[model samples]
Target: ESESSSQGLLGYYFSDLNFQAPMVVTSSTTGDLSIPSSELENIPSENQYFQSAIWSGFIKVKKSDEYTFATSADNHVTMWVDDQEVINKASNSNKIRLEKGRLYQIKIQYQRENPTEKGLDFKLYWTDSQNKKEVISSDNLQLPELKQKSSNSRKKRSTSAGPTVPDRDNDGIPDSLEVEGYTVDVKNKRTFLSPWISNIHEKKGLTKYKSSPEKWSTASDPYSDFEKVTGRIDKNVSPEARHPLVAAYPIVHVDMENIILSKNEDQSTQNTDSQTRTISKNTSTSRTHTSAGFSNSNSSTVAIDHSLSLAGERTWAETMGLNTADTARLNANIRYVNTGTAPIYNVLPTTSLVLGKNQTLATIKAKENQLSQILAPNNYYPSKNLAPIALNAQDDFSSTPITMNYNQFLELEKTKQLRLDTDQVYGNIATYNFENGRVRVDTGSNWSEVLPQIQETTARIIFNGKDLNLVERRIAAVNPSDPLETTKPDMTLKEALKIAFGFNEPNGNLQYQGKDITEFDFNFDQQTSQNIKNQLAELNATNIYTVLDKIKLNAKMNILIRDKRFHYDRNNIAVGADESVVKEAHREVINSSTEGLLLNIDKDIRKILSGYIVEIEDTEGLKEVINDRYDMLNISSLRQDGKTFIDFKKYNDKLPLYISNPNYKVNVYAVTKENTIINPSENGDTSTNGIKKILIFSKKGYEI
Candidate 1:
């Protein structure tokens, strides 16, 4: 309890902390300064120049009403009612909705040299709390009355005092999390939080950060009691740099049509008997002439073997003023271009075909003379076909993406779930188990020995970020037909990867890394800072200090993923940024005044990277509090959903681990804890003596 009796209200806290400390200003009191405009002539202007007074305070209201406080100030005046700063005088007016019996703290800040004229009247005209409009008087307005206290009173601490709830550090996670092994390095500014939450009741409720006893604030982003830390990512982690290794094919279809050509020369038969008649012009001017189809000057009847002599003939016809006929003369190869697997002739063109230009006898002779190759690319082929290339907004991979769907799984456990199992190999022979709760892959060395040169071992792939999603949300239950318990899915191998190993997003292929790619591209290698480098070297040198050395690794990945530290926007993105387009699109500068959620991946994959200076042992032989330092330390145990055995693999690494191939059939397989395969019936009946699958997704050239 405070040391006073009438502690009902407090006055406005005013201070001129930034002003010069020269005058002893007295407390001034007032209710209304509505001095009449007519008295304006009586007061003379006298500039004293140095004294300034502030008169803004918290005023108590006894009722609630929507009211307006009207003011007309010659000098600049400002105002606020309750939390709403409703008015600023130099450039403003009134807006009000006030509450009853509550203190509205109005703060006014401004300076004036001694009065230049009559003191500016603060005429507070108002629609009163009682809904009546009038001038405010001292009888209604109040001075916040401070409750008086007696000299005999002694100070007392909080009700829950000492050990019950002592939180002096002000870190809100509670003193319990800090007590027992979950405390903070108040002096060094480091804190310990543990993931060993499974047995918290027995040791009292306490969780630790992943470090065994993480290095001091000597680490990154730890400028406070609870700091943010994140490490660096690959330099090439950007849009153009990581333009999804999408399965795209350009100019998918190419066709060359066999164009039939009509002879450019005459079709007439040459002979003296041909229609060679002379028109009687003037008696002296009459001369002999052959029919239009026959030429007397050259070999009269010229026929073109359209297939072999088209190109040069067409070129010759244009030049000799003898254009090929308007329509094709012969039937041969039909030619038209079409892209991948189209019904190429869906709707045949109904319009009459226009083959080429007119013909002349001179053109025929010219073509026959130079008839080597039938057509020249530069001569007869349509100019449209000549270009031979183009690009569409959508690509050969159009079907690849639209047809894509998400994958799911049932929850492994309600909470603190554990999953562990065994494996049996082919031929019902080789069965194996984990050695020390760890695995050592031979890089396919064992499989290399058994198979006759398999193709999938060392493969090259472009990470098609477009085909992947940032998060895999649950879509449906495993089976509606099941007479058993339905399950909820956990985070999958693929969704988790986009975070661990960076990739572009779908749609615009946005980069998940935010605003400052280089800054957000944060490097904790301490490659630049000698002190940090030396600390890591010291940790390396001293086998006992692990947290210091971890500063070199992704010891800071947790801080980088937080929402507060990083930002993302939709349509508007920073194109002028130095980072990749994918990055600029996803990251925005976080408002310094605001706080938000952060992607806390403090538990992604940091296991051995954390420890408790060993309790020397769990019961208590401890070397250091290593478990909390790195915020990791859990032995994984994936739940085995009954006995099930299955084999599935898509031999081509060229395709993503998954794909949308509609033509293939999909099947659900149960790869069990033991060398077992539980296959469900064609209609999903796992009720019989068979295996049950954990996840049902189609892969290996198939789908479910």
Candidate 2:
């Protein structure tokens, strides 16, 4: 360890944040760097903002152990150990193991921005395994070792030497590499290096920039004459810098050949001696003539060797003359892309906009009420031709949105069937909420509109906003008295079984035990055949067996696999009225061609009325209600004089007046109990309403 010095860490204070130029320099001998806020060393009283100080030196440790160091500061401070940052800016304690008898480099950068109050705080404390926490002591500090200064008189030279190694033009590259075919160009003061030499330097990533080989000149081309002489490199001095040229070497083909002489013969010594004497006499005469023409010839001396070699460091402009004023303008012109005032275009305002409110039940419900007001039945015209009259075509068209309640909307739907054009009478009406009931009408609107109605009224139900489909739960069985079950005679067991078993044997008979057996014979057991025959006989006594026995089943089979298991067999039945039943039951009609049968059964259903009981649960804990109501819809017409027309007079006999308006006291008793056929309560009621029932006029039935 070094001896303790009288002066501790040397601190250089700077007015700037980056310590670019130190404004004041001071020495602190205090072991603990607890400088007061009012008397910071050597800092000018007026210049305090952005004040920064850095103390760097070798720190010697007294004992070897894991030592914890921390910095406390109001602004910012960073402490480094062995050139690695250990503690930074009012941060957590950093533990580092520092051995005794070894010196480690330590640096601390502190910034004091006396912005708030007159307060400045920066302290560094250390604790070892002994748990003695205190500020760093001056006994373990030493000043950094100074670097030795080198002499300027020592010249820079290259060690590479040969007859062709000289750089006469003083360019960075050797003459051997710059010249081609062992020949030099003395005419031009500057010349380009060969492609092979440029390629070798370029492939090594030594060339400054990629340019054509023609640009790799032997001498630097300065921007101006003043810079050409002033900024020229001093080749004979030490620490003079020179950079390699930027160049490119394209690929090309060249021819190379090798020559050899294997054998030759020597003869006639006298004749060779005579020729040698004549050559010697001519050489003596030429030497005497050369000495007379040129005197004062000197011998060549060895060139100095330099260690530094030129590498890619600067561009063409920078290498030529970077300090020249024109270089800055040239760089600025090359960097920019476009210049001119940009043209401005007008932006149009939006025609319509929607502002969102914070999500809540009240906000959603208010929007629902607003939508019900705008889409009321009174807003739409009775016919498409008159729709233009209700539209916003004129600027001064005075109109108000028609608001409607739940009871008023129901009254409009009830009397719609009484008009001449029943469809035209029923304009647009949204879903309504009643006394615990919801009444919705299908008005050919998109599912998007209907979805909002469902979400608004049914507050307790959560629905996904993506694809929605109406799937039949198939919870209830079809009642025989309903018009939907419109077939005259029910199909017999023998006929249904024979049709199901026909899938196993496409032909009439299957070769069982090498003997032909009918589909009925193959499917029916002994007791099954006996019981079916008895039932058929009883039906025959009532004159129903003949019709049911002749009715054949025509259906396709689908063998399905779900969840890796085969699904149970199910039957979908298409029903019809009296005329269709009589015709469709015949063997001729059942086996007819598809096109002929399509034209045959293209007729509509004979009945006109339908009823449904759609029960729904609005709130989870509350009772479910009967949201769907009775619909005495007109679906078909009876023909007269070759003209088919709807007759509203037929509805008078089936519908009761008191049941239509069950809100009245006299009719309240009728809907007091939930009977699925008709419940006309203005508000909904729930009593035995879990199962949903639907009855269509002359429709079909299927089991799922």
Candidate 3:
């Protein structure tokens, strides 16, 4: 019979272990094991005997007489015997030495950083020295063994499962596993998972806007209360903003090229090149010509040949010549000369000429040349012995001793008037006068009646005592048919004084000068004054305060419904409701109004109403009550016929109130909760209060 030796042989066991006597041995270690850089992938980093064992947890070893344990670890390693730390190298490598004849309990713990496959290896073995034999104790080590460790270990490992270990205060969780739900092992600390190790549960149901309590427990399905704590699902966030509701409409743009090309294409094409060429040729020709004609020859033939050019060049000077000195001298002398007739020179008479001192022969020659034409006469023949004839007796023409007869001269002046230029005189002259009072009467002429009043007053004054001159009489008659005429008569000095001193008698009687005229009187009635006061009071009593209150309520509703920040209480929005009607209205306005959504006046009103009702359901104590009482809180929308309806359950637990007229067909949806169908109606009713409908007016083709 063969009696087997009772200890197991080990080479390198770089893993955790827990020992149990007589049958199977158990071990655990990190799945990520590596060798030292020197040996690296060439070394086996895993246990050969126990292929399925991971290195993250504790392992076991049986009680033996003699055992030897060795391992290399980068960070920490420890060995325990019966809950006692026998060989502890918490900082690095550890080796275990055993003695025979005593029961041995063993455990190994180690941590490796940047571990190569060969670096993390460990070895364990036991031998019977008395018999001089190696041991083979448990062959059944092929099966796995389970052991119970401290609850702390379970908590630590569970927390360490992820990269981010939440700190409750600074990091919103604690370092210890019992305090925090997860541990962060990554460099940046982002990874997180639930800490309860008994079950695979993710705690995503925390309130989106507020942190949950540290000791808060979760239900079997944590997501069931997701909306209750997380608040409203805002469509404005993330992917929704990228593709918004307005983008659904098609964009319109002008087709400029098509419009330009559509009208008379052939005509445009025909004119394109020809018009451009004509303009270009005309511009080039204009630049080639000079206005001065300096290129012409000096000869008469050449000058005559270029007469047209000369004429063109002198056109401006010729046009302005009549207004200058040359034309004035010509007019005074009454002489004309032509180049073709004679080379007649122009000269000033000796009386008009001035001479300077130091005149030499050349100066004298110049002076003679200047006076030559005036000194020369057309003919040299002289006449003598001519007697003066007696003046014609009836002609009244006298060369000497001419006497001017005033009356006869005046008559002659009148005869000259026959040739007088009447064009010099402007129309007929009419004198204006102020002495005669004139009065104007109305006529259907364009002239105002004020002119006629002035005329009549002037005539009346002249008829009475005023002697009006022609100018004054003319002025009095000015535009007598004018419409804007004053009827008041011009008062005389005596009558004016009497009116100014209030000397006019009552009952149309004149108190000529001294008698007392009645004192001015003004009447005041009590009834009329009271009536006026009553009217003013009525005007002042307008209900502006009530209107302002209603406006405030409407504004609050708008803020709650349209604001994304106030999304939590969107369901409480209602028409004409204030914060007292829905407690969440204030909070919603504070939250969601940061980014407004309802822009149009009508849409803002509807949004306020819708959000008011929803906010009522979010109030602190009254949320559940309102949600259950109004049916509006839980019911997001109603069907067209007011029969079938949609609820908040379909969306992320968010409901929209259907406040549309129920008479028409409408489709309403809760966009925030996941495009949930709130209402789809074939026919709708409008009888219910707070009922809303999207109106569909009859189009040109479509009937109701």
Candidate 4:
């Protein structure tokens, strides 16, 4: 019969080897239909029957060599290239001439008819004129899919241009319908946008994408980055409008005398009679006689105790002329003018300092900003001890163990009591006791307590350098927002938690709501928040299946491995040269993908009985210790048995070519580790462990 093959979209079917239609097992538009034998075991039936498998596809032949058809099967296989049956028997191979660049109809039929045999295996290899062999891959097979010939009523138009063509195995969409920034993989059916390469600041990985990511690009260049860099030279543009640099303050200097107050008492006066007078003044002279020279005696009349910046006005009045109580109050008023929350006013009054034609308030602001920054509550903080933590964590609940600097700490102290009597500073409590050498709250129970401390400490000290002892005064203590001060004016923790969690709503009239909050605003830690959300979600969960999916607890386990021994048979009896060839063959088998399965079975297999033993050779049980040459493969379906059939055989031939050796053939049998056994004598082994004689790699292109 002339070859009857479908040229358009191809499909696969498996049936009984006879004219009978075995269960048509599979039908799909496969680019390639090459599979190994064991895959046949998934057939819907449990019974052992002579079965047939067919791979139908449009194949392209290139370079036009007479193709040799080779197949290895358990019992029988008949293969046809287009029309002529090439290999029809169980023993071997055949060849046929094919044309170049032409599509050929291919149908391969393979069967295992021996009633006693169970396993079915088939393989196909095509050798070119130069004798190179390869297992047919998805590369050469073609599946023309545009037809979709189900019926005339249904129409599928992929593009506006016309009827869609077979756009398979190619990258990108049809030019007319292609969208912006995206590329498509027609065969794999994937569409995605390309990475933007213009941003110099984007990730270096943008240059290349690997399945599991790793980027080779250097760190981003500085302007934004610098120290972690090298080979950095200046850009030539000589860039834009350069403005004069701004200094922290103006060109100004001032120095004045400090007054030291005296406590009057009856005491011995200094009786220095020596007198010295030096004459000097600005560019002239008016030097006076000095008598209290370089002396620390109690009798000394003059003292240089402190500077003006350090002393209060009260100290000045008593030290100078205004010692009386009435005038002392005036000193307090003078001191209050420049300090506190009060803004500096009235100095630049009623166009007192009129601006020039082009000038704005910029010059005045330049001066005010300097004073404000300089006067920022640095006095209340010990600059050396203040460590600023950029406290930031993610929105995700659960263990987001945030890192903190070792010295990031807060000191809550009332340097001076609100009450002026009895040296009664309410408390200087220090919570130096940290958790895990760090103050962190993973759960709310602890966070509720800990967050308040940070907030109160920061508010009292960071802003004003002190929080009032409202608790001692029966007034509310600094209400550092139970959720905490997330922003500046920590009156506060210099920390930045407020930005992440708190609202920075000002009280509208310009001041923040004071620290004396009467009611507690409960603050939940990330863990508590998530737990509550999860519980709420559970109440609305649509079905039990989704909720029933139990989350498995995970562990970081180190797979400590043990030393393994490679099988080495030194006698030429199995494969030759002290079984050295056999050793190489064993190596290939051990290193193949079957190695993983073997190890897994050894682990889960509780009993040695369930654990199995197989000849560690690739082509197992098919060989005849003696050959009438009538070694008919009789396969028996053995379920629940472990047999590791090596797949690496097709990749290389050095190991197996030697296995074809006679005396050098070594029979290495590895028992399940769970003997972890072997006996050379058959009669003494009396246990009827007739090992199943079948090719384990039953499917072509697929290995066990």
Top of the candidates by lDDT: 2
Instruction: Give a tens-digit lDDT track for model 3, residues 1-704.
Output: 00111112111222223211001111212222322233222112242122111122222334433333333332255554434554444332233444333333333444343333333344332333243323223431111111111222121222122122232322122223322222111112111111322222223221111112221111111111111121111211121111110000000110000000001122323434432110000000000101111111111000001011121223212432222222111000011111010011222111110112111101001122232321111110011122211211236353222222333222221221111000111111111110111111112211122223222322110000011100001111111243221111122222322222223435454442333222111111343234324544655644322221121110000010012122122112122323232233222211111111111122222232331122222212222212221113223233354322223233213333332222322222111211111222224321123333222111111111
Higher-lDDT candidate of 1 and 2? 2
Using Cα atoms with residue i matched to residue i, what is each candidate's TM-score against the true structure?
A: 0.17, 0.20, 0.19, 0.19
Predicted candidate 4 versus true structure: per-residue lDDT over 417-445, tens digit per residue:
00000111111111111011111112212
Off by over 4 Å in 1: 1-29, 33-51, 72-75, 91-93, 110-115, 118-120, 129-133, 144-704
Note the Cα lDDT for every prediction shown: 0.23, 0.27, 0.21, 0.24
Instruction: For residues 368-482, write the lDDT of model 1, one tens digit per residue.
Output: 2132221211122122544421111136343211110111001110111111110111111011111111112223223213211111110111121221111111111112232
Q: Considering summed lDDT, which 10 consecutive residues are worst modelled in model 2?
A: 278-287
Q: Residue 432: error of model 1 in Å?
A: 84
lDDT of 3: 0.21
User: By TM-score, highest first, what's the ranking?
Assistant: 2, 4, 3, 1
Regions of model 2 farther than 4 Å from truth: 1-5, 34-44, 112-114, 117-120, 147-704
Candidate achieving the largest TM-score: 2
